[PDB]
Design an enzyme around this catalytic site. Structure first.
Site, PDB file in Angstrom:
ATOM      1  N   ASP A   1       2.767 -11.294  17.669  1.00 57.47           N
ATOM      2  CA  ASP A   1       1.728 -10.237  17.915  1.00 57.47           C
ATOM      3  C   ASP A   1       1.043 -10.937  19.175  1.00 57.47           C
ATOM      4  OD1 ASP A   1       0.595  -7.872  17.519  1.00 57.47           O
ATOM      5  OD2 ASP A   1      -0.940  -8.601  16.576  1.00 57.47           O
TER       6      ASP A   1
ATOM      7  N   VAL B   1     -16.413 -12.127  12.175  1.00 61.80           N
ATOM      8  CA  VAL B   1     -16.564 -13.488  12.669  1.00 61.80           C
ATOM      9  C   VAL B   1     -18.162 -13.486  13.300  1.00 61.80           C
ATOM     10  CG1 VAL B   1     -15.499 -12.354  14.549  1.00 61.80           C
ATOM     11  CG2 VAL B   1     -16.131 -15.009  14.616  1.00 61.80           C
TER      12      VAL B   1
END
Ligand SMILES: *CCC(=O)Nc1cc(C(=O)NCc2cn([C@@H]3CCCC[C@H]3OC)nn2)cc(-c2[nH]nc3ccccc23)c1
Length: 279
Positions: free
Chosen positions: A137, A28
Site C-alpha cells: 500500500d 493519532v
C-alpha cells in the site's frame, strides 16, 4: 519494554500522564512530553475498538519496532500499556506527501522527489531483505516529511491496498506480488510530479482497474522539463508486464537513484517555505 520513552538516546521512565495532549491530527494525537518538552505523535488504540482495526495497529507496530536501524521509516520511541488503551509513541513529522500536493496547489519540483524516491525505495528494499515484508500500500499518504528534510515511510497495516495505486499483476495475478510496490511508487511519482492524478475522471474503484490494464502506463509529459534519468525511472516502475519489472536491487543502481544519493539538496528549506503558505 513498555513505559519508556527513548527520544534520541535518553531513556525516560514515564507514564501516559506525563504526556500533555495538544489535539487530534491526521486516532493519532499530537502530544507533548512534560518532563523534557518534546512534542511527539501518540497513536491511541482502544481495547474496546474494532478487531480488524486494532489487528492492523499491532502489525505495523511489530515491524516499526524491528525497523529501528532504518532511517527511512518512522521510529517508535516507546509504548504505554494501560488497562484500557495502548499508546504508541511515534516521532513527529511535518506532513505527508498527499497533503503537500494540496498545499502546493501544483507539481512538486523534481529535486524534492529525487530525495523522496531514494528514501522510499531503500525503505521497501529494507523491508524485503531484513524482514521479508512487502508494503502492499504505497501512496502519497504514507510518505511523511518534516522541517528537517527527512522523508520516511508510515505505518503499513496490510504488510488489499488502495485500488488506485494497484499493480497490474495484483489485479489479474497469473498463477505473486514480489515487486508490486514498484508500480505503486511509480503512480505516486507521476501524481506528485504533475499535480494531477494519472487516472482522472474515475468515479468507481473498478474504472481505474480497467484503465490500468486496458490503457498504456501514464508517463511523465515531456514539456515540463523533467530530467531524462527521471523519466526512465517512471517508465521502469510503470512497466505493465510484471515479469519485466525491475527488482529493488536494480533500482538502487539506476542513474536517477544514484544521482540524488551523492547530490545534497535542501529539502528542509523548501519544506518550510511551502508550509508557510497555509490556509
Ligand atoms: C497524510 C496525513 C498525515 O501525514 N498527517 C499527519 C499530520 C501531522 C501534522 O499535521 N503534524 C503537525 C505538526 C508539525 N509540527 C512541527 C514540528 C514540531 C514543532 C512545530 C512544527 O515545526 C515548526 N508539530 N506538529 C503529523 C503526522 C505525523 N507526524 N508523525 C507521524 C507519525 C506517524 C503517523 C503520522 C505522523 C501526520
Amino acid at each position: 519494554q513498555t513505559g519508556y520513552l527513548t527520544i534520541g538516546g535518553q531513556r525516560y521512565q514515564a507514564e501516559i500522564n506525563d504526556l500533555e495532549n495538544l489535539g487530534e491530527m491526521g486516532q493519532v494525537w499530537k502530544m507533548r512530553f512534560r518532563k523534557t518538552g518534546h512534542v511527539i505523535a501518540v497513536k491511541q488504540m482502544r481495547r474496546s475498538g474494532n478487531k480488524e482495526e486494532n489487528k492492523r495497529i499491532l502489525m505495523d507496530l511489530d515491524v516499526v519496532l524491528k525497523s529501528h536501524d532504518c532511517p527511512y521509516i518512522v521510529q517508535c520511541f516507546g509504548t504505554f500499556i494501560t488497562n484500557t488503551d495502548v499508546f504508541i509513541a511515534m516521532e513527529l513529522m511535518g506532513t505527508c506527501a498527499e497533503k503537500l500536493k494540496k498545499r502546493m496547489q501544483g507539481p512538486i519540483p523534481e529535486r524534492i522527489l529525487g530525495k523522496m524516491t531514494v528514501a522510499i525505495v531503500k525503505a521497501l528494499y529494507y523491508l524485503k531483505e531484513k524482514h521479508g515484508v512487502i508494503h502492499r500500500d504505497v501512496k502519497p499518504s504514507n510518505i511523511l516529511l518534516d522541517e528537517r528534510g527527512q522523508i520516511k515511510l508510515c505505518d503499513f497495516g496490510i504488510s488489499a491496498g488502495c485500488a488506485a495505486y494497484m499493480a497490474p499483476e495484483r489485479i489479474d495475478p497469473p498463477d505473486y506480488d514480489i515487486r508490486a510496490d514498484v508500480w505503486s511508487l511509480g503512480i505516486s511519482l507521476v501524481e506528485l510530479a504533475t499535480g494531477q492524478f494519472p487516472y482522472k475522471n474515475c468515479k468507481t474503484d473498478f474504472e481505474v482497474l480497467t484503465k490500468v490494464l486496458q490503457e498504456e502506463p501514464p508517463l511523465l509529459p515531456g514539456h515540463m522539463g523533467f530530467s531524462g534519468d527521471f523519466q526512465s525511472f517512471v517508465k521502469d516502475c510503470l512497466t505493465k508486464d510484471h515479469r519485466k519489472r525491475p527488482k529493488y536491487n536494480k533500482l538502487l543502481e539506476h542513474s536517477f537513484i544514484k544521482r540524488y544519493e551523492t547530490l545534497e539538496v535542501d529539502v528542509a528549506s523548501w519544506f518550510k517555505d511551502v508550509m508557510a503558505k497555509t490556509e
